[PDB]
Amino acid sequence: GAAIGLAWIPYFGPAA
């Protein structure tokens, strides 16, 4: 979704 439900990973990097 990249809306809100998935707003934890950014810590590791959006383009992991």
Side-chain angles (χ1 to χ4, degrees):
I4 181 60
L6 182 60
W8 58 280
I9 183 185
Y11 290 62
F12 301 66

PDB file of all heavy atoms in Angstrom:
ATOM      1  N   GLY A   1       0.828  -1.238   0.000  1.00  0.00           N
ATOM      2  CA  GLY A   1       0.000   0.000   0.000  1.00  0.00           C
ATOM      3  C   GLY A   1       0.843   1.261   0.000  1.00  0.00           C
ATOM      4  O   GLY A   1       0.556   2.208  -0.736  1.00  0.00           O
ATOM      5  N   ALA A   2       1.883   1.276   0.826  1.00  0.00           N
ATOM      6  CA  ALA A   2       2.770   2.428   0.917  1.00  0.00           C
ATOM      7  C   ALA A   2       2.010   3.672   1.365  1.00  0.00           C
ATOM      8  O   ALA A   2       2.360   4.792   0.996  1.00  0.00           O
ATOM      9  CB  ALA A   2       3.454   2.677  -0.417  1.00  0.00           C
ATOM     10  N   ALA A   3       0.967   3.466   2.163  1.00  0.00           N
ATOM     11  CA  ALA A   3       0.157   4.573   2.661  1.00  0.00           C
ATOM     12  C   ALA A   3       0.434   4.833   4.137  1.00  0.00           C
ATOM     13  O   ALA A   3       1.030   5.849   4.497  1.00  0.00           O
ATOM     14  CB  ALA A   3      -1.320   4.284   2.442  1.00  0.00           C
ATOM     15  N   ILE A   4       0.000   3.909   4.989  1.00  0.00           N
ATOM     16  CA  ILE A   4       0.204   4.040   6.426  1.00  0.00           C
ATOM     17  C   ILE A   4       0.495   2.689   7.067  1.00  0.00           C
ATOM     18  O   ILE A   4       1.370   2.570   7.924  1.00  0.00           O
ATOM     19  CB  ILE A   4      -1.021   4.675   7.114  1.00  0.00           C
ATOM     20  CG1 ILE A   4      -0.771   4.831   8.616  1.00  0.00           C
ATOM     21  CG2 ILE A   4      -2.265   3.835   6.864  1.00  0.00           C
ATOM     22  CD1 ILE A   4       0.416   5.711   8.941  1.00  0.00           C
ATOM     23  N   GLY A   5      -0.245   1.678   6.641  1.00  0.00           N
ATOM     24  CA  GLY A   5      -0.061   0.340   7.175  1.00  0.00           C
ATOM     25  C   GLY A   5       1.377  -0.135   7.072  1.00  0.00           C
ATOM     26  O   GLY A   5       1.803  -1.008   7.828  1.00  0.00           O
ATOM     27  N   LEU A   6       2.126   0.445   6.138  1.00  0.00           N
ATOM     28  CA  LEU A   6       3.521   0.080   5.942  1.00  0.00           C
ATOM     29  C   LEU A   6       4.428   1.293   6.133  1.00  0.00           C
ATOM     30  O   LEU A   6       5.107   1.729   5.204  1.00  0.00           O
ATOM     31  CB  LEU A   6       3.722  -0.514   4.543  1.00  0.00           C
ATOM     32  CG  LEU A   6       5.145  -0.978   4.227  1.00  0.00           C
ATOM     33  CD1 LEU A   6       5.582  -2.056   5.206  1.00  0.00           C
ATOM     34  CD2 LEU A   6       5.232  -1.488   2.797  1.00  0.00           C
ATOM     35  N   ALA A   7       4.427   1.841   7.344  1.00  0.00           N
ATOM     36  CA  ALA A   7       5.246   3.007   7.654  1.00  0.00           C
ATOM     37  C   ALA A   7       6.221   2.714   8.788  1.00  0.00           C
ATOM     38  O   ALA A   7       6.399   3.524   9.698  1.00  0.00           O
ATOM     39  CB  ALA A   7       4.363   4.190   8.012  1.00  0.00           C
ATOM     40  N   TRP A   8       6.856   1.551   8.721  1.00  0.00           N
ATOM     41  CA  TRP A   8       7.825   1.143   9.735  1.00  0.00           C
ATOM     42  C   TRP A   8       9.152   0.791   9.083  1.00  0.00           C
ATOM     43  O   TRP A   8      10.224   1.009   9.649  1.00  0.00           O
ATOM     44  CB  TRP A   8       7.319  -0.078  10.499  1.00  0.00           C
ATOM     45  CG  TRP A   8       7.048  -1.243   9.599  1.00  0.00           C
ATOM     46  CD1 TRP A   8       5.941  -1.448   8.827  1.00  0.00           C
ATOM     47  CD2 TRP A   8       7.941  -2.324   9.316  1.00  0.00           C
ATOM     48  NE1 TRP A   8       6.070  -2.620   8.121  1.00  0.00           N
ATOM     49  CE2 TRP A   8       7.293  -3.171   8.399  1.00  0.00           C
ATOM     50  CE3 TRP A   8       9.219  -2.666   9.763  1.00  0.00           C
ATOM     51  CZ2 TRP A   8       7.886  -4.336   7.916  1.00  0.00           C
ATOM     52  CZ3 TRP A   8       9.808  -3.818   9.282  1.00  0.00           C
ATOM     53  CH2 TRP A   8       9.141  -4.642   8.365  1.00  0.00           C
ATOM     54  N   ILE A   9       9.059   0.223   7.887  1.00  0.00           N
ATOM     55  CA  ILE A   9      10.228  -0.196   7.134  1.00  0.00           C
ATOM     56  C   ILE A   9      11.147   0.971   6.755  1.00  0.00           C
ATOM     57  O   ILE A   9      12.363   0.802   6.737  1.00  0.00           O
ATOM     58  CB  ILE A   9       9.824  -0.951   5.861  1.00  0.00           C
ATOM     59  CG1 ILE A   9      11.069  -1.455   5.132  1.00  0.00           C
ATOM     60  CG2 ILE A   9       8.986  -0.063   4.955  1.00  0.00           C
ATOM     61  CD1 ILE A   9      10.760  -2.103   3.802  1.00  0.00           C
ATOM     62  N   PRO A  10      10.604   2.174   6.432  1.00  0.00           N
ATOM     63  CA  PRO A  10      11.426   3.331   6.056  1.00  0.00           C
ATOM     64  C   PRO A  10      12.691   3.451   6.905  1.00  0.00           C
ATOM     65  O   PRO A  10      13.706   3.978   6.452  1.00  0.00           O
ATOM     66  CB  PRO A  10      10.495   4.534   6.293  1.00  0.00           C
ATOM     67  CG  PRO A  10       9.213   3.965   6.818  1.00  0.00           C
ATOM     68  CD  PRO A  10       9.183   2.527   6.393  1.00  0.00           C
ATOM     69  N   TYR A  11      12.622   2.941   8.129  1.00  0.00           N
ATOM     70  CA  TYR A  11      13.759   2.968   9.036  1.00  0.00           C
ATOM     71  C   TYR A  11      14.937   2.201   8.442  1.00  0.00           C
ATOM     72  O   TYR A  11      16.091   2.604   8.586  1.00  0.00           O
ATOM     73  CB  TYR A  11      13.380   2.366  10.390  1.00  0.00           C
ATOM     74  CG  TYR A  11      12.429   3.220  11.206  1.00  0.00           C
ATOM     75  CD1 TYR A  11      11.152   3.528  10.744  1.00  0.00           C
ATOM     76  CD2 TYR A  11      12.814   3.722  12.441  1.00  0.00           C
ATOM     77  CE1 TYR A  11      10.293   4.310  11.492  1.00  0.00           C
ATOM     78  CE2 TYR A  11      11.960   4.504  13.195  1.00  0.00           C
ATOM     79  CZ  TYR A  11      10.701   4.795  12.717  1.00  0.00           C
ATOM     80  OH  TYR A  11       9.848   5.574  13.464  1.00  0.00           O
ATOM     81  N   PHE A  12      14.633   1.098   7.766  1.00  0.00           N
ATOM     82  CA  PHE A  12      15.662   0.277   7.141  1.00  0.00           C
ATOM     83  C   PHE A  12      16.023   0.827   5.764  1.00  0.00           C
ATOM     84  O   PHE A  12      17.159   0.692   5.310  1.00  0.00           O
ATOM     85  CB  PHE A  12      15.195  -1.176   7.008  1.00  0.00           C
ATOM     86  CG  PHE A  12      14.836  -1.823   8.318  1.00  0.00           C
ATOM     87  CD1 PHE A  12      13.744  -1.383   9.051  1.00  0.00           C
ATOM     88  CD2 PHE A  12      15.595  -2.868   8.817  1.00  0.00           C
ATOM     89  CE1 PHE A  12      13.418  -1.975  10.256  1.00  0.00           C
ATOM     90  CE2 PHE A  12      15.274  -3.464  10.021  1.00  0.00           C
ATOM     91  CZ  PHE A  12      14.185  -3.017  10.742  1.00  0.00           C
ATOM     92  N   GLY A  13      15.047   1.444   5.108  1.00  0.00           N
ATOM     93  CA  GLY A  13      15.276   2.004   3.788  1.00  0.00           C
ATOM     94  C   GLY A  13      14.129   1.723   2.833  1.00  0.00           C
ATOM     95  O   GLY A  13      13.797   0.562   2.592  1.00  0.00           O
ATOM     96  N   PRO A  14      13.499   2.768   2.265  1.00  0.00           N
ATOM     97  CA  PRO A  14      12.382   2.601   1.329  1.00  0.00           C
ATOM     98  C   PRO A  14      12.706   1.621   0.209  1.00  0.00           C
ATOM     99  O   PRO A  14      11.863   0.820  -0.195  1.00  0.00           O
ATOM    100  CB  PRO A  14      12.175   4.007   0.765  1.00  0.00           C
ATOM    101  CG  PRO A  14      12.683   4.918   1.830  1.00  0.00           C
ATOM    102  CD  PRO A  14      13.822   4.191   2.489  1.00  0.00           C
ATOM    103  N   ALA A  15      13.937   1.689  -0.290  1.00  0.00           N
ATOM    104  CA  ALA A  15      14.376   0.808  -1.364  1.00  0.00           C
ATOM    105  C   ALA A  15      15.260  -0.312  -0.824  1.00  0.00           C
ATOM    106  O   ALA A  15      16.390  -0.498  -1.274  1.00  0.00           O
ATOM    107  CB  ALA A  15      15.113   1.604  -2.430  1.00  0.00           C
ATOM    108  N   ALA A  16      14.735  -1.054   0.146  1.00  0.00           N
ATOM    109  CA  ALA A  16      15.476  -2.154   0.754  1.00  0.00           C
ATOM    110  C   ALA A  16      15.823  -3.219  -0.283  1.00  0.00           C
ATOM    111  O   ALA A  16      15.413  -3.062  -1.452  1.00  0.00           O
ATOM    112  CB  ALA A  16      14.674  -2.765   1.892  1.00  0.00           C
TER     113      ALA A  16
END
